[PDB]
Design a protein around this ligand. Structure first.
Ligand code: Q4U
Lengths: 412, 412
């Protein structure tokens, strides 16, 4: 047997906001966080826009001196984590610190630091590389810094599964608690891949929208005029907690995490199979894990990246899994508003799935002006839809064909 | 309920060889894999040597057209993975492909490729960034490419926990099998951080030995004249398999994985605590997980990096965990010969621990000419020691205070 895992705290930086409630207000209003990227000469680039975090003040979290040691993606991960831990009300003590761990990940890690240190290396030579280049750039330093700052001695690790990172981080942290290796985990992901290297690297694969004239209309999941994903920055963290532990201290419980699925497509380095067979296996594994029938799902937060092949693969996968229930659930892509936060996508979208449960509302897929061929599900086009939601899924389908699904259920 | 996990296949690239038997021959003969680096000009660097993989032929594994797309860390991880799967005798079929996954990790991943593309970006422009920049560099793509080549549809992920990566990858993969999420996992790690940012960045932290004039003597764990770690490249992969699945197909079983521990130090971003308190918590977790009396431990493959603080912290931790039995077990650092493969260290060292069990021999700590203050355990100085080994423990410690321990034992 297995213990129950609940969500007691959430934290976020996104293109919509510097916290969860500001971000969520944007989501339910259909607001875009996408804009031309500033303080960068993007003249030579085919994409000049994305989802930046606006007005982030790291000195609310760290001293200037500690922040100078860390890449932006680590700053963002620590901000969401500190928010989530504050939101949980949890008191770390000598009696529980060995039972509290961290799994905060990233898909691409420290590109901004790699750029700035490459500048020094190329121009001046290796003796100008920062002493903090390695520890301030490696993906496990959100978990590392958070554990040092809060005195967490539980399991300490970091996943990196490209665009699936946040989903896998949360699911695997839930397993840690369910199987008794921890009582509390801080889990999620963070990403800062604006930089030239993110825009240039994805741009070279022609993976990005190039709708430079109308950045807010670029991310248009399942719309016939979509032309690839929009790159976005930020972070999501959840406090996952064993249910009896949460009840004993009088925690506020947002929702229960009942299911976690994983699969591999074993198909292609970057593209999904046309029928989303892997995504279907992963959703079926998550529902089996939750002991739920597909007919019990009310709301899906899609991966919904605005890539032609990805978006159609998900429709096929959902039709395959859900059969005569596929039209009754509501499925939306919040990436229509946030863009694609890569390894943090699954983290912020797990939060939006939990808030869909709290508020009984399916967030919109904005920009869905002309659904493409076969995109005839309830994709919540344009405007948020109040509805009954007992069970919400969140999907992430990333490079290497790596798939993750989380199942959340209302708690009372 | 929790299933038993055995080792049925192993694969490796190291500074001592292009497979496991050749590497292990070097280990038992006390041979150094460390030499001046030939693949780039290091005259401006304070460290000009390391553990390179010599004579690697990627066309033993993959077409030249595919290999040109992939950072060396991916090529090394695939080579070790392919060797491990072949060594296992396992046949992937429609009946089992959903139950076989992969967890191959890296500390830094494709830094060579990111550096080369950053040079293109800065000197020329984004138009010269490779289309394969992202899928040829990011850490999850060992697991990704391996799954595509062999048709593995089970859990597909990657850890990145700095120098603890290979140990965490193997332990977490064992938990997948133990808890019924998979029947077979390919798990381990790969690293190739020997580029200007890697050598420069560890150099700027003054973390590396600067013994340029005698590279084979540079790595000297617990020696009073040690002056930092030696940077090394390669990969380890193991096929982990549920016991009854291995028995059912008549697999050759090398050893059983009986224990896994993690802990965070919660001490410092890069320094280990002097008393080894986090390492001790991690080993005690692993020994309890294995249902063992600490006196059952015969052999410890130490982290043993040849840093002043790391090496003495490990003595303190072993004395704290094992008490008077600390004087009866044998503990060695194979990094004395291989150097520090960073995210691959725990993977190659897990393999060396399993071969210590197969061959009933403790590998030597070479270069241990003058053991430092308090370094008065059996550290198998200079020469391999034939001895009874029923239980072997492999330790890793990393940036962020992240600790892993694996416990292996002979299978009958
Ligand atoms: C054109 C050469 N090939 C196919 C063998 C490749 O580059 C290749 C194989 C996989 C997997 N991804 O890409």
């Amino acid at each position: 047997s297995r213990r129950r895992v609940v969500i007691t705290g959430m934290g976020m930086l996104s293109p919509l906001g510097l916290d969860v409630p500001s971000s969520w207000e944007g989501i339910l209003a259909g607001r875009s966080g996408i804009a031309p990227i500033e303080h960068m000469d993007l003249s030579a680039y085919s994409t000049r826009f994305g989802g930046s975090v606006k007005g982030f003040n790291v000195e609310e979290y760290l001293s200037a001196k500690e922040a100078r040691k860390l890449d932006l993606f680590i700053q963002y991960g620590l901000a969401a984590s500190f928010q989530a831990v504050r939101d949980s009300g949890l008191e770390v003590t000598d009696a529980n610190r060995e039972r509290i761990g961290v799994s905060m990940g990233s898909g691409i890690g420290g590109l901004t630091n790699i750029e700035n240190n490459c500048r020094s290396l190329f121009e001046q030579g290796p003796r100008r590389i920062s002493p903090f280049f390695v520890p301030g750039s490696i993906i496990n330093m959100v978990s590392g810094f958070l554990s040092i700052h809060l005195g967490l001695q539980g399991p300490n690790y970091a996943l990196t599964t490209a665009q699936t990172t946040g989903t896998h981080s949360i699911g695997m942290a839930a397993r840690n608690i369910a199987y008794g290796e921890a009582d509390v985990m801080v889990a999620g992901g963070s990403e800062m891949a604006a930089c030239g290297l993110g825009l240039g690297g994805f741009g070279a694969a022609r993976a990005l929208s190039t709708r430079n004239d109308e950045p807010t209309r670029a991310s248009r999941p399942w719309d016939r005029d979509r032309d690839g994903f929009v790159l976005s920055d930020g972070s999501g963290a959840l406090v996952l907690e064993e249910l009896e532990h949460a009840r004993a201290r009088g925690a506020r419980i947002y929702a229960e995490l009942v299911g976690f699925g994983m699969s591999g497509d074993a198909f292609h380095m970057t593209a999904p199979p046309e029928d989303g067979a892997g995504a279907a296996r992963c959703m079926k594994n998550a529902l089996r894990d939750a002991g739920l029938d597909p007919r019990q799902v009310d709301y899906i937060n899609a991966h919904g990246t605005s890539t032609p092949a990805g978006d159609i693969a998900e429709i096929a996968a959902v039709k395959s899994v859900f059969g005569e229930h596929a039209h009754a659930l509501s499925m939306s892509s919040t990436k229509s508003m946030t863009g694609h936060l890569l390894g943090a996508a699954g983290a912020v979208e797990a939060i939006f799935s939990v808030l869909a449960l709290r508020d009984q509302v399916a967030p919109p897929t904005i920009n869905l002006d002309n659904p493409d061929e076969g995109c005839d599900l309830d994709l919540v086009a344009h405007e948020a839809k109040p509805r009954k939601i007992d069970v919400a899924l969140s999907n992430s389908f990333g490079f290497g064909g790596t798939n993750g699904t989380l199942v959340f259920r209302r708690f009372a």
